[PDB]
Amino acid sequence: TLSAGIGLFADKTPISLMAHQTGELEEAAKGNEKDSISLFSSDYTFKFDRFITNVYDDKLEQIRYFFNHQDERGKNFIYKLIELLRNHDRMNMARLAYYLTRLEELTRETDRDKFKTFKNLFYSWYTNKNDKDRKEAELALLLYIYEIRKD
RNA sequence: AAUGGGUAAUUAUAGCGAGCUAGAAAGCGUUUCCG
Question: Which of A5, A63, A76, A99 could form a disulfide with A26 if both were Cys (CB 3.0 to 4.6 A apart)?
């Protein structure tokens, strides 16, 4: 198998700093199980199979299918979900539960069913104890809010 | 009958509990001493 580190950098930067930082990323990926990919950071070191079949093909398609077929929720909901994924106390489970149930009712009753499906999926992979589906969801939201930013 | 007195409840009830934009952007990634 093979293991990879994928950095992410703005333009007009060196290729020595860049190569060294993603070398540190591939070494943090080597340290995991040496079958692993570290997108962008020293955490986020996923196994490669879980990155393919549980981040692209599972979570990020279900995020993209939500936020492109509704108008009322936007960037702000995504940023406030990213924060609750990044903190994750025991209290933030209840706070995320209150937030998502509180935004059930605010939808147009035509999109309340689709928001309810997204509510159930996001709460289910927030309160999963195994800590796989939580950092995978955080990375899926990072990639999705990367790929929809304007100038 | 006259006289002297007031007494018992309820003290807020039902909701909303924040929403959407922005989530960093331009520059500089080496220069001099040195051959």
Answer: A5
The integer distance in angstroms from the CA atom of A17 to the C1' atom of B34 is 26
Interstrand relation of A36-39 and A45-47 (parallel, antiparallel or unpaired): antiparallel
Which one, of A25, A65, A24, lies nearest residue A46 by Cα?
A25
Resolution in angstrom units: 3.2
Contact A60, A122 (CB under 8 A): no
- Classify A106 as helix, strand or coil: coil
Site of tokens 């079949």? A53
**Integer Cα distance of A149 and A110 in angstroms:** 27
A13 touches strand B (CB under 7 A): yes
Please identify which residue in the block is written with the tokens 């924060």: A83
What is the SS3 assignment for A34? coil
- Residue A76 CB lies within 7 Å of the nucleic strand B: yes
Say how far apart CA A85 and CA A5 lie, in whole Å: 23
